[PDB]
Design a protein around this ligand. Structure first.
Ligand SMILES: O=S(=O)(NCCc1ccc(S(=O)(=O)c2cccc(O)c2)cc1)c1ccc(O)c(O)c1
Ligand SMILES: O=S(=O)(NCCc1ccc(S(=O)(=O)c2cccc(O)c2)cc1)c1ccc(O)c(O)c1
Ligand SMILES: O=P(O)(O)OC[C@H]1O[C@](O)(COP(=O)(O)O)[C@@H](O)[C@@H]1O
Ligand SMILES: O=P(O)(O)OC[C@H]1O[C@](O)(COP(=O)(O)O)[C@@H](O)[C@@H]1O
Ligand SMILES: O=P(O)(O)OC[C@H]1O[C@](O)(COP(=O)(O)O)[C@@H](O)[C@@H]1O
Ligand SMILES: O=P(O)(O)OC[C@H]1O[C@](O)(COP(=O)(O)O)[C@@H](O)[C@@H]1O
Ligand SMILES: O=C([O-])C(=O)[O-]
Ligand SMILES: O=C([O-])C(=O)[O-]
Ligand SMILES: O=C([O-])C(=O)[O-]
Ligand SMILES: O=C([O-])C(=O)[O-]
Ligand SMILES: [K+]
Ligand SMILES: [K+]
Ligand SMILES: [K+]
Ligand SMILES: [K+]
Ligand SMILES: [Mg+2]
Ligand SMILES: [Mg+2]
Ligand SMILES: [Mg+2]
Ligand SMILES: [Mg+2]
Lengths: 425, 425, 436, 422
């Protein structure tokens, strides 16, 4: 029905293994990855990656989120970076095969006894310029997150706050920080100076694990492909680090100086893309899914209940994709927390939600711009078919494939409760 | 509530090991779920009366067995009529009507190699009188099942064939017999004479395990409550035997002389009901569900894919029930094979399918009598509501419960593909 | 297949078809059930002990010799019936039949004698008759007391007090026969040597459909605690009058063994029934089949995970020895024991290898029948001058008895468990020996 | 306090997810560092005084890269290593043996090159303990190296370097005839796509752990430390992940051979390895190793598993084993105990070679012999206890597992004892 060749690709022999030891033993360098790359790439924008033409190359290479480091540059400089990013993104708004939404993240300068005057001003700039994410520097306690939240003024409550853990206090107060944050960034640069360098891997693995348990995005950052700032190829330790961040459970991987000031920004994005695809296929879904399953508490929220049912159904038939209709991105996030091997194609009318779902591993956003149908059920089918036709166009789907479709019983956010098994025609 | 988590062996169900599970079993933890293992009662002089059969239906009898080793065709036609009269005496209240299957147990081949002439005549009698199941005696090979199928003719295509394994050859050729049969009966009486008495438990446990693996019904039969033929209470070995047949994985438990000729046919049914409810709550679903999921192969059939997604969703929210619309009973059978703790309420218009789904553990058949609505989505909703109303009346559901609703995308058998999370109002 | 491939080439394909070995290699319990084979013959010696109640049907010395040969390990004296004179005669007849085989020490089979008390009845504590019967047991050298209707830890303390200073070595097995005993189980097990699931009274005190929950819970907790547990009453009830049992009865025996019971009992089946020897033979046949059907892969891991860390060298050596025995498919584990404790600690990890316990204590040899898989050997030789040579003679005695009885063959591996100095409590050594 | 150290809360976890969640940066490692450090000897690490600092820092194996330097140069390196090692022999209870490994130049465009035949004969003549055979592609390559060592080099360990696609594809046949493997990531990263090397590393480490044979992770582990005093975040992560993968040895090439911070690179590998070893999820690892290991009728193999099981049961501080060839210690090591495997040996070569096995701490027995063999055994067991106490492995009140044999000579290990310290 699928062929012997299908079961030799994307580490399927290693995925069938009964133990983790057998899984490692069955990893094959000749087993090619087939699924789309699911770990998002955050690229820091700087002199090496600011031009509209250079940004088009980086979008094509795999950049999903553009990071603006507010430790350097003026508001005028960053507004120009935003405009250049938006111009390069909208240059693909014709052909859907190349049109991909790109998120814009503001990385704050940091504190000091409270939120800094500069941080308050930069956060206000982010709201005024419609940024999607804030990477809040040096978060030490829950009250730091609340201060950043307060600063996202009256109009920026939809912006996602990703708290950067950069010191011992942040590591120790992690649970209270994650509870009030949208996600976490393992800011290894400062963390490696604040705590012993040989202890950073424990902090990374712990934080990634707790974020996977909570179902919140986690970013692995700093010195991932450091040598690529000057050299065209990375070291053996660097490719290993990227692969292990993906295997650890990181939703996003980041490039700092590699894309901001280095000689090979596009090549660094291409390298992260190549390694992430390989590492995602090497994930031991058998144990991962059962552990996520057992660790997740019982839920009476129909979205959460539908998400696990959909991911279970996708594994049962080797579904090509899970197509989900989402207004805020939440239904796609709850599918993503169970780490399916199937791509989560999220169809949304919210341009912000389409940009923000790049924070979640395996979510492929589609922005729907069609005029609404008079009958709601008709409008729902039109978006499901949009997901299928885009999936076909991009290579995710083919006729005869099975897809899982996640929808809700009534319009508006918060009513996801339906899972359909559909044959692609 | 705290009280909810003390009932139906919920502390023992949360255990991380089978040893801890046994240690947490509580005699004060009352069973809450409806009894899911079916009771087959053999009809005879002690249970032939229409008034006596009404008491047995109320006590829990799901399948009426006609032993064709005794009695004439005239005798068995009268048994069938009395059963049908007692069953239809409750059809005035459709929300509480309980369907009862009629099974013909053949006399067997005796000294002969193949299908006896009496068996051919009895099988044609069964087709003419509309029996739902055939318990084919002394099945030794796949060709014996084919001969029974041939004797049933074109009109008996819908009758279910449950092969009785009564000797060493049947045990050795088990796989080929199960492949062509609808299910199996562990006929312990003859099996205990054909093979050493001390080896029968190995044959019972093996056959039950293989039927659970295959997703096909398995009946445990003979001497389960033997002492209740003359005594009002069973022995300690007898209650233990019933409990262990349920814990082994048997879909059905049987009463022979206990209901056919004894002095306690109603009490024997009540006893089997009481023990089965206790034993079903003591099932270690944590290990069982994982093992059934792991052992079940990948499938591209949307009914099979929806079934596993629905059972996974039911466990996630502690769903009170899984309401399924079924024409042939197949959708209910595929839900049943994953052994959910949630009751599988099967709503059907087929009176034969409603009788035959009693062969599957945890399937509660509801016969829907209304003629089809003009709008198909309205006819579907009306059936789902009938399942909710019946389930509320019978104690399966209460307001505030979560239920998983399993339906299809078009009318007719074979199109189940939808799973939706519903809240009882 | 790679985890057995070499041992398969060495021991042969036939070895791996016997004693439910394909079912034992299974990765899941479902696969284990699926692989159970009626043609896979049991090879190991029967490890669950058989307790036979002595009565009119089983009192003659000649009848008792047949029952010893059939598999009876413990003789139960029901003090609810019969006088002290009657029970002293039963004891004498049992001892006469047991000692009739003492001529060959390499094949002698010890038999324990257990006194089952009448109980408190309407009373709150120890009855006057129980005090008199317990005093009789001490005077007649009984090995075990099955204390009727134990409801709390103070009941077991009263039985211990009644046994006095001379009955300190007697094992107290508390009978759980009512709701209070089930609810206060943990405190009762803590102060008892073991438990008996007295299903007859328990089935009247609590709903009959709840007894299996009580049986499975108590057996599980006793397995967790490492203390003996007996399953009792109506196991082969129909065999009192019929030569073959019902399908529910064989199932019940098999399931008590599969549950984790150390001992299985016969009451009326041997005390008054027409087939006492046939009932013992039936329990023996079913137990041997059920023991091979145990899913040791999950059982050993669960016992291992549930057992807390220990700093007692006997406990540490016991787990190391059972692990070593599973690694090489050891035919037996030979252990030197004074009180039976080292053998009991090996037994709690439920090895598939027979635990051959070599002891000089005739009482310990009788009492280790309470522990599943322990095969007692009574050493009658006087002590050697060098202790290190006395120990080596006791190990060789175990190897010779094991060879003589069919437990060991040339080429087999055996695990030997000993201590560093004489006296009880110093077990700390494990050795891997090849049988020549 | 004992249960808060060495990631013990994370070790008690019922799932790997819970294990990651419980990892604590404040939980200090207490056990001795188990993963051996191989340091490449070069201009930056050749002086006797420099080598004493590297021995003190944690270097267990000295690698001589025969791709550069003459036989005269390498003989001087060997002499300087031996001089620095023997400078600590005055205190036998604290003396640390150091192995010497010859890394061959390789076949290049060619079977076994003429230079390799000459270098292998040099190794035999100079008493090297290990050979890291470059570019092994098939079992016949290993046989050729074995032949070039001759009858005088029967005891040298051959660690095959997997550096290309053919070596990865023919891995099983190479491991079968080799003593161990080296994941030579430098050449492997050029021969196969750079993004596929982690799959080859994890597969080879897993198969070596399965086989019970040593596996070395090599190349660019702390590369930036050649010029900088601190490594990158990717580098510390790489070292930690090689240990977490199951590597018996970790290597330093340019970092120690030509770099500005050779001692600091050794100290860094030591610090990371200790942290990573405590973060190992022994609950799942031991079970998987147990299940995957086949049934055995060799009493050494049977005693090894029984001893590791007993060590976990009592939280044994160490497993003291008497070994002639190092085999009994290797069979204990394959089950990855948390307890240190203190191997007491009279063979100086076996003491150097057991560094290839993770968690084996070699002690050279140089005390006078007892007339009664039973007394000679108990004295060697007391030697292990005294060296253990002095080095911090043992304290009074600890439990130890002692592994011995029934008769003198190699191949007779069959006894395990539970002993209380003092
Ligand atoms: O032998 S054992 O290793 N376990 C096996 C017993 C058992 C029974 C039932 C289930 S089920 O998860 O309900 C289930 C699963 C699959 C198929 C199925 O039909 C049922 C699981 C396990 C053992 C015995 C005693 C013990 O006291 C112990 O700790 C371990
Ligand atoms: O996809 S996973 O299932 N990877 C399992 C990862 C893992 C790693 C190490 C060990 S080991 O027990 O130390 C060991 C055992 C055997 C061989 C060995 O060399 C090591 C066990 C498990 C997963 C990822 C992220 C998670 O957050 C999660 O919950 C599950
Ligand atoms: O993920 P979110 O934000 O909860 O959105 C999911 C919602 O999308 C839908 O599928 C479609 O809703 P709309 O028609 O309003 O877009 C709803 O039925 C469901 O509640
Ligand atoms: O279990 P079966 O026999 O395949 O029946 C399931 C069928 O029932 C339905 O839910 C309802 O169908 P009907 O309207 O014909 O009753 C179908 O959509 C589905 O195909
Ligand atoms: O099982 P127990 O009662 O602790 O007895 C085990 C004892 O038996 C021995 O192996 C032999 O001791 P004895 O010389 O007293 O018979 C002791 O070394 C050990 O302490
Ligand atoms: O690990 P190896 O090489 O097999 O050596 C283990 C050997 O060491 C001993 O424990 C002590 O032997 P020696 O007295 O010859 O040193 C032997 O009994 C055992 O056979
Ligand atoms: O700010 C950061 O990215 C860091 O500190 O690693
Ligand atoms: O037919 C039966 O029921 C039997 O033989 O047990
Ligand atoms: O006393 C007993 O043995 C009983 O009640 O079962
Ligand atoms: O020779 C090596 O070690 C390499 O190339 O990595
Ligand atoms: K910044
Ligand atoms: K019949
Ligand atoms: K009594
Ligand atoms: K080289
Ligand atoms: Mg920073
Ligand atoms: Mg029959
Ligand atoms: Mg009683
Ligand atoms: Mg190289």
């Amino acid at each position: 029905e699928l062929g012997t060749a299908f079961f030799q690709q994307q580490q399927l022999p290693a995925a069938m293994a009964d133990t983790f030891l057998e899984h490692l033993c069955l990893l094959d360098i000749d087993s090619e990855p087939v699924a789309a790359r699911s770990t998002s790439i955050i690229a820091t924008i700087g002199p090496a990656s600011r031009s509209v033409e250079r940004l088009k190359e980086m979008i094509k290479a795999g950049m999903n989120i553009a990071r603006l480091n507010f430790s350097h540059g003026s508001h005028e400089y960053h507004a120009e970076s935003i405009a250049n990013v938006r111009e390069a993104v909208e240059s693909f708004a014709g052909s859907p095969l190349s049109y991909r939404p790109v998120a814009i993240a503001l990385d704050t300068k940091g504190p000091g006894p409270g939120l800094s005057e500069q941080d308050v001003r930069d956060l206000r700039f982010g709201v005024e310029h419609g940024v999607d994410i804030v990477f809040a520097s040096f978060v030490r306690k829950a009250s730091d997150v609340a201060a950043v939240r307060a600063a996202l003024g009256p109009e920026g409550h939809g912006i996602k706050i990703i708290s950067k853990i950069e010191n011992h206090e942040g590591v120790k107060r992690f649970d209270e920080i994650l509870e009030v944050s949208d996600g976490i960034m393992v800011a290894r640069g400062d963390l490696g100076i604040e705590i012993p360098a040989e202890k950073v891997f424990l902090a990374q693995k712990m934080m990634i694990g707790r974020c996977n348990l909570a179902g919140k995005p986690v970013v692995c950052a700093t010195q991932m492909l450091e040598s690529m700032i000057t050299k065209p190829r990375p070291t053996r330790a660097e490719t290993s680090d990227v692969a292990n961040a993906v295997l650890d459970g990181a939703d996003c991987i980041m490039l700092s100086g590699e894309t901001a000031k280095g000689n090979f920004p596009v090549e660094a994005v291409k390298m992260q893309h190549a390694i992430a695809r390989e590492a995602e296929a090497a994930v031991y879904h058998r144990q991962l899914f059962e552990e996520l399953r057992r660790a997740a508490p019982l839920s009476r929220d129909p979205t959460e209940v539908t998400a696990i049912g959909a991911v279970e159904a996708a594994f049962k038939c080797c579904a090509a994709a899970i197509i989900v209709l989402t207004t805020t991105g939440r239904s796609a996030q709850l599918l993503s927390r169970y780490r399916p091997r199937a791509a989560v194609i999220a169809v949304t009318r919210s341009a912000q939600a389409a940009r923000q779902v790049h924070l979640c591993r395996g979510v492929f956003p589609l922005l729907y711009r069609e005029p609404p149908e008079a009958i709601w059920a008709d409008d729902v089918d039109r978006r499901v078919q949009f997901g299928i036709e885009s999936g076909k166009l991009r290579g995710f789907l083919r006729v005869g494939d099975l897809v899982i479709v996640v929808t809700g019983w009534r319009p508006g956010s918060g009513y996801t409760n339906i899972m359909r098994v559909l044959s692609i025609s």
